[PDB]
């Protein structure tokens, strides 16, 4: 393949969300999408940005013969808190490093006590999941079954469990510099302000000092581009040309129109 400075469509990168953008919901990428990405990659820079860790993208996008980092110019697991450029790791930080062990424990202890005191129809397990760039917090717990999650969602619609807990956290930890995002049925995310998918754009911008390539056309594709979705900020950011997709078929259609492919 070609170096980034040799791609013919100058100053241009396409960044993709993984789940329901490059891959069907809860499946691996198709060969047709891989073929289209490789064609796109002869024209401009490509990358992905996803919430989950590298291992997850390796399952969804890579194989036993192919490391996912070989398939994209830029890989941004964990919203870009982890990053790869042409297979090489970029320097990174983590949530626990940024907040520190002691403050992290204050946060966790508060959350555990809050959940012990919270009255709910059902409690299960996996109330806090620790990830590299955030925690995920669930009052019922992620071990809730499919049907328990449906029931919690409806209960939460009525009782505002997540909203009241977010507000309680903001009041307990007012100088912690955290953002709270309620998503899906049973949980909300907690991370340092700015550690949404826009975080990855720093790596794209830093390319200027490596190859000299200045990415002024930054296409972003995502399926949760509405307020409150995980793609909302990166979609809305004036640095990107945002493209909202319903799924991978829609992604392919838009890409083919966008680049005459």
Query: What would the two tokens of residue 142 be?
Result: 């992620």
Active site annotation includes 17 = yes
Q: Report which residue's Cβ sits closest to Cl ion.
A: 127
3-class secondary structure, 168: helix
Binding of residue 86 to its own copies (CB under 8 A):
no
Binding of residue 103 to its own copies (CB under 8 A):
no
3-class secondary structure, 12: strand
Query: What would the two tokens of residue 97 be?
Result: 């490093």
How far is Cα 180 from Cα 165, in angstroms, rounded to an integer?
10
Asked if residue 82 lies in contact with residue 76, where contact means CB atoms within 8 angstroms, the answer is yes
Q: Which is nearer to its own copies, 104 or 259 (CB)?
A: 104
- Binding partner of residue 20 among Cl ion, Mg ion, its own copies, none, CB cut-off 5 to 8 Å per kind: Mg ion
Asked if residue 61 lies in contact with residue 28, where contact means CB atoms within 8 angstroms, the answer is yes
- Binding partner of residue 50 among its own copies, Mg ion, Cl ion, none, CB cut-off 5 to 8 Å per kind: none
Active site annotation includes 164 = no
Asked if residue 94 lies in contact with residue 115, where contact means CB atoms within 8 angstroms, the answer is no
Per-residue interface string for the shown chain with its own copies, residues 105-124, x marking contact by CB under 8 A: x--xxx-xx-xxx--xxxxx
Site of interaction with its own copies (CB under 8 A): 101, 104-105, 108-110, 112-113, 115-117, 120-131, 135, 141, 143
By annotation, the residues acting in catalysis are 17, 19
């Amino acid at each position: 393949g070609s170096a980034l400075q040799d791609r013919p469509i100058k100053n241009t990168i396409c960044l993709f969300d993984v789940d329901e953008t490059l891959t069907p919901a809860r499946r691996a990428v198709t060969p047709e999408m891989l073929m289209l990405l490789s064609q796109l990659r002869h024209k401009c820079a490509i990358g992905y940005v996803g919430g989950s860790n590298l291992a997850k993208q390796q399952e969804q996008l890579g194989t036993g013969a192919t490391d996912v980092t070989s398939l994209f110019d830029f890989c941004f697991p964990e919203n870009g808190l982890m990053a790869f450029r042409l297979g090489k790791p970029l320097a990174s930080t983590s949530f626990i490093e940024w907040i520190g062990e002691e403050k992290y424990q204050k946060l966790v202890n508060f959350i555990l006590r809050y959940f012990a005191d919270l009255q709910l129809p059902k409690k299960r397990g996996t109330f806090i999941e620790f990830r590299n760039g955030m925690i995920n917090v669930s009052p019922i717990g992620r071990n809730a079954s499919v049907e328990e999650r449906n029931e919690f969602e409806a209960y939460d619609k009525e009782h505002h469990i997540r909203t009241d807990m977010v507000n309680a956290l903001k009041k307990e930890f007012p100088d912690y510099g955290l953002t709270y995002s309620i998503g899906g049925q049973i949980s909300f995310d907690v991370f340092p302000t700015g550690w949404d998918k826009t975080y990855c754009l720093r790596h794209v911008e830093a390319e200027k000092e490596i190859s000299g390539v200045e990415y002024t056309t930054i296409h972003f594709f995502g399926d949760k581009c509405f307020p409150g979705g995980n793609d909302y900020e990166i979609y809305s950011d004036p640095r990107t040309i945002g493209h909202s997709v319903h799924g991978p078929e829609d992604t392919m259609k838009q890409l083919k129109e966008l680049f005459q492919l």
